[PDB]
Design a protein around this ligand. Structure first.
Ligand code: TMP
Ligand code: TMP
Lengths: 68, 68
């Protein structure tokens, strides 16, 4: 299907007046395992924007640091 | 094209070929530093695409993870 499916949405960091969003989601390319993704999303969610993907350790490393 | 890593906050990742995924305060092209997350060469002269965040966007992120 060659597409990016938001498996799960976690958080919404911002939103511009045009209705795009900065989100943190678990996102799945082409049926591959869902990775952690912080990215700009269009209102309907069809078009996505720029942003990084994270492996588990990266995210986990990250959140543990925002924690102690 | 110019940038500036003004503060390094956290390193999330090694890499087989020495890249590092980092959370930083980066300024691009003379613009005020924003919080920024991407991959960096071992010599931080090359990078991949990545997300940048306002501070409100960044704290919104940190908060949420402190609280789950
Ligand atoms: C045109 C341009 C913009 N930027 C700025 C605008 C964005 O805030 C951010 C995205 O860089 P990169 O990821 O494509 O950096 C660059 O780093 N490099 C460029 O060549
Ligand atoms: C000098 C230079 C910088 N950049 C910036 C913008 C991106 O955030 C990052 C690399 O992105 P890229 O993978 O799309 O080229 O570095 C380029 O994309 N191309 C260039 O030629």
């Amino acid at each position: 299907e060659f597409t990016f499916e938001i498996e799960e949405h976690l958080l919404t960091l911002s939103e511009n007046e045009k209705g795009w969003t900065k989100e943190i989601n678990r996102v799945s390319f082409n049926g591959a395992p869902a990775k952690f993704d912080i990215r700009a999303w269009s209102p309907d969610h069809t078009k996505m924007g720029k942003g990084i993907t994270l492996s588990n350790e990266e995210f986990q490393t990250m959140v543990d640091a925002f924690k102690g």
